[PDB]
Amino acid sequence: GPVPSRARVYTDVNTHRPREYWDYESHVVEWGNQDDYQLVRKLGRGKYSEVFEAINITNNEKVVVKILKPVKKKKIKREIKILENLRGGPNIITLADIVKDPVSRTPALVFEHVNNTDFKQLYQTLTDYDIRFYMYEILKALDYCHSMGIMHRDVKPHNVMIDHEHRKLRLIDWGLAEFYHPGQEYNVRVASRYFKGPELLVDYQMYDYSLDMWSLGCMLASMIFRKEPFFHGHDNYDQLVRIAKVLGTEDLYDYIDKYNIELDPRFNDILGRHSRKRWERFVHSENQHLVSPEALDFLDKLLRYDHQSRLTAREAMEHPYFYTVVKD
Numbered sequence: 001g002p003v004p005s006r007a008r009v010y011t012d013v014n015t016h017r018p019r020e021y022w023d024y025e026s027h028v029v030e031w032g033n034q035d036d037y038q039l040v041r042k043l044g045r046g047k048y049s050e051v052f053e054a055i056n057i058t059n060n061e062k063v064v065v066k067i068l069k070p071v072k073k074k075k076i077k078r079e080i081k082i083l084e085n086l087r088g089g090p091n092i093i094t095l096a097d098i099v100k101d102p103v104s105r106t107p108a109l110v111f112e113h114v115n116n117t118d119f120k121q122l123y124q125t126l127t128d129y130d131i132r133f134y135m136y137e138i139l140k141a142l143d144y145c146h147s148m149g150i151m152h153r154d155v156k157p158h159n160v161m162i163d164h165e166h167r168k169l170r171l172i173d174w175g176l177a178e179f180y181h182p183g184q185e186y187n188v189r190v191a192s193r194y195f196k197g198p199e200l201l202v203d204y205q206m207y208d209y210s211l212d213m214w215s216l217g218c219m220l221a222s223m224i225f226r227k228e229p230f231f232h233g234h235d236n237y238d239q240l241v242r243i244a245k246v247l248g249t250e251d252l253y254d255y256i257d258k259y260n261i262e263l264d265p266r267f268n269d270i271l272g273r274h275s276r277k278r279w280e281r282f283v284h285s286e287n288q289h290l291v292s293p294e295a296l297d298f299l300d301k302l303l304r305y306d307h308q309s310r311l312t313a314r315e316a317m318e319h320p321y322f323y324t325v326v327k328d
């Protein structure tokens with residue numbers, strides 16, 4: 001069978017927490033007053049929720065209301081419990097309230113307002129300094145949730161909300177997040193296609209926090225090279241081929257051999273043989289002001305096939321790439 005794996009950090013955080021902390025199925029929801037919130041306009045609809053701008057009429061302040069679509073009581077409690085555990089942590093979206101929506105008959109999560117700048121337009125203007133700054137802010141959120149025993153599992157530009165005016169960032173949509181338990185096998189159908197780690201793409205279930213670091217690397221590559229998304233696969237199989245055309249096939253085989261993983265035989269016809277590439281080939285006159293040896297080395301240390309070889313969030317914050325970022 002497959003060789004087992006463990007997170008190299010924060011391995012036993014939930015092991016030594018009290019059970020109430022991670023046993024979300026037993027969580028009892030404290031409901032607020034739904035009449036406190038007046039929906040103003042619909043902001044978006046996803047597979048699992050609808051999101052509204054609203055006003056809290058007890059203080060006339062803007063809030064965001066996330067009305068959950070019907071799904072397992074468990075997935076709902078999971079998100080709720082994770083948001084409550086992480087509340088107050090650096091750059092984590094703040095759950096302010098939970099109410100029963102009378103129409104959907106589901107929970108509506110109430111969040112602090114976040115004034116977004118759309119990432120497709122935002123990523124067009126970000127300077128070298130901006131990219132470093134906001135990456136550091138994302139790392140704070142990831143080190144925090146990882147240190148608290150939780151992996152996000154859906155890190156992507158859409159879930160990183162940025163108020164560029166006040167240089168404020170929030171990591172949102174914890175609906176796919178999970179508690180890390182050593183030796184636990186997880187569903188590989190998480191994250192958006194372009195941000196799925198190799199572990200998901202080769203069906204290795206015993207993954208951990210380090211999955212988020214691959215996704216972060218994909219975000220970094222799209223930003224400093226001005227190519228979004230960076231690995232642009234047409235499906236989950238082609239997604240792995242796109243990655244192997246950059247990282248090379250021999251290290252992919254080293255990866256799956258280490259964990260005694262077997263590739264889907266459907267790869268026999270499409271994978272081919274590919275050298276590992278140097279990151280400089282993606283640099284050109286239109287993105288070179290965003291690239292430095294520090295950026296390339298940092299990217300290189302995030303985008304590793306072997307989830308155990310990737311930088312942890314904390315190690316990432318130690319990287320010379322962030323030396324120029326002003327510390328508060």
Ligand SMILES: COc1cc(/C=C/C(C)=O)ccc1O
Nearest residue numbers: 043051064093111172173174
């Ligand atoms: C889709 O999930 C979330 C969305 C938002 C805000 C979205 C906005 C302001 O467009 C906040 C928290 C969430 O969990």
